[PDB]
């Protein structure tokens, strides 16, 4: 019947053709205030207050529309009392929990109309976030755009104790979220003026999520005792950076962590790097799956855990193009078992170590499966010992230092 009264509130508003007289219809809203006392039958209930608060909200909107031809600061000091009373009425024992966040943001928009006071929206991260990547992509842009100037303007860097992050970390997360949710072309002033502060304040402990800049792969080739290592092509989202980016291929028992670099000046789209890698592990084995981290360290580890179990199987096999390595052969032997290891030597010299690996201890150079490490060795001879010997395994880790 209040809905029928809302139909009555839809009635005279249908028959309104004078905005000075319709403010007297706002006095009919005062008569709805004389219905607001005439709808009350008790003190408090959930559904009673939920039915009660909406007519007061419509009267508050009519009172806001009453000042359309403009009490100097009395409106901007006093409307928050009725707004907080309406939010307290609609905070009564029902799941109407987007009225609370929108009413708190409506109070925060008038707090920013004053001096840049103590914040409630920026207070709690999630609260201020309000499902940034779950709600929409417009309301939270302004709900972060006010909070960015609120945390920037107040100039006191002791944050709230939901989590004491009393630094530029919360404003850097706000800058990253606002740059992620922006338009591409028009956000240069939004990018630079909040990317400049984290250069000077490099807290620089950030673990981002990489939705701004994307990546894609290609084939893998060789280099001068080095791996060309999957000459990737990246996208672009902002002006520039300087990152020592590295990918991470990882097999079923190790992690290559190849495709590294030192410097980058990525500004243009289809970035199309080369990512030359030393330290080519696993003898360039074919089962190196892509953990696909691509941790582009633009003064922060802006990683991307692009993981699956798709078995696309980045192979990236080896090549022998007159580069220094080491081999294993056991020719010119006597009547007992041995081994030998010759290296295609070069100028710079460093160490290597060989280890046996089986279910039992099959080979035994010492009493146990030893190392026999050496520096600047061309060819030598290593013996073995007794087991059920047909074919054992080996691993010859060679820190050669021909590269870095």
């Amino acid at each position: 019947a209040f809905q029928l009264i809302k139909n009555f509130i839809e009635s005279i508003s249908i028959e309104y053709r004078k905005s000075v007289r319709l403010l007297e219809f706002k006095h009919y809203f005062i008569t709805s205030m004389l219905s607001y006392f005439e709808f009350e039958n008790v003190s408090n209930p959930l559904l009673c207050e939920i039915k009660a608060e909406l007519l007061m909200l419509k009267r508050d909107n009519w009172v806001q529309g009453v000042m359309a031809t403009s009490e100097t600061v009395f409106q901007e000091n006093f409307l928050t009392l009725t707004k907080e009373i309406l939010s307290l009425f609609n905070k009564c024992e029902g799941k109407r929990q987007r009225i609370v966040d929108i009413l708190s943001i409506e109070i925060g928009l008038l707090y920013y109309q004053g001096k840049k006071y103590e914040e409630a929206v920026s207070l709690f991260l999630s609260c201020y976030e309000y499902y940034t990547q779950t709600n929409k992509n417009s309301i939270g842009l302004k709900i972060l755009q006010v909070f960015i100037d609120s945390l920037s303007h107040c100039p006191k860097l002791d944050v709230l104790q939901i989590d004491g992050e009393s630094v530029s970390a919360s404003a850097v997360l706000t800058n990253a979220f606002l740059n992620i949710l922006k338009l591409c072309k028009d956000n240069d002033s939004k990018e630079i003026w909040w990317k400049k502060f984290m250069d000077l304040q490099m807290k620089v402990h950030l673990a981002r999520a990489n939705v701004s800049a994307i990546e894609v792969n290609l084939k893998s080739y060789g280099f001068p005792e080095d791996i060309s290592t999957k000459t990737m092509r990246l996208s672009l989202k902002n002006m520039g950076g300087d990152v020592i980016v590295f990918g991470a291929s990882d097999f079923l028992l190790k992690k290559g962590e190849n495709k590294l670099i030192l410097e980058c000046r990525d500004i243009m789209y289809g970035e199309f790097s080369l990512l030359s890698f030393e330290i080519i592990v696993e003898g360039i084995t074919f089962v190196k799956e892509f953990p696909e981290n691509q941790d582009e360290f633009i003064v922060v580890p802006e990683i991307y855990c692009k993981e699956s179990t798709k078995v696309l199987v980045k192979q990236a096999h080896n090549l022998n193009l007159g580069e220094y390595a080491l081999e294993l052969k056991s020719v010119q032997s006597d009547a007992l078992e041995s081994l030998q290891v010759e290296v295609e030597v070069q100028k710079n010299i460093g160490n290597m170590k060989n280890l046996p690996v089986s279910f039992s201890m099959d080979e035994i150079q010492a009493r146990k499966r030893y190392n026999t490490p050496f520096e600047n060795v061309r060819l030598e001879y290593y013996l073995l010992d007794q087991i059920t010997a047909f074919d054992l395994i080996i691993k010859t880790s060679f820190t050669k230092k021909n590269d870095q």
């Binding site: 209040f2 809905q3 839809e10 508003s13 249908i14 559904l47 939920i50 039915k51 909406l54 419509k58 909107n61 529309g65 029902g94 799941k95 109407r96 929990q97 987007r98 009225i99 929108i102 779950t134 709600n135 929409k136 417009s138 309301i139 302004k142």
Partner: protein, 144 residues
């Protein structure tokens, strides 16, 4: 008669489209207006004062609120959970019932044109770039 925003909300409360049909206006000036109204109109579907019954093949229209001189009108079709909310400005309403049924056939056009591109049998299934940028080039055809 000519709306000022349309909006479609999925099975969850995630918005599929919050679309303004007078797109790049002189009074663009924010998109917050016609957005916080949709965010409160999802909350007005579990308000107990209004209720949508569950017996008929043709789901029903409602007149939920008015704010900013913009009236909203909402449907919950009950089967694919589709919460569809529209707005008009206040003095374009005449108060009659022929425009009310014209609003109902505005709904029966826009429900049809969403379920057509829900059944476009070449898209990958999701809320990608393709579905929104097909919905806008059909709504620019409907609303000039």
């Amino acid at each position: 008669l000519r709306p000022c925003f349309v909006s479609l909300i999925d099975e969850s409360d995630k918005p599929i489209l919050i679309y303004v049909p007078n797109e790049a206006e002189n009074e663009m000036n924010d998109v917050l207006k016609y957005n916080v109204l949709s965010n409160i109109s999802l909350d007005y579907f579990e308000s107990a004062l209004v209720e949508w019954h569950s017996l008929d093949s043709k789901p029903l229209l409602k007149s939920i609120f008015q704010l900013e001189g913009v009236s909203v009108f909402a449907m919950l079709i009950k089967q694919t959970g589709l919460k569809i909310v529209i707005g008009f400005e206040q003095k374009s309403l005449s108060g009659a019932d022929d425009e009310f049924e014209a609003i109902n056939q505005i709904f029966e056009t826009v429900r049809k044109i969403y379920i057509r591109v829900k059944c476009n049998p070449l898209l990958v299934s999701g809320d990608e770039k393709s579905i929104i940028k097909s919905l806008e080039r059909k709504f620019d055809e409907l609303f000039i």
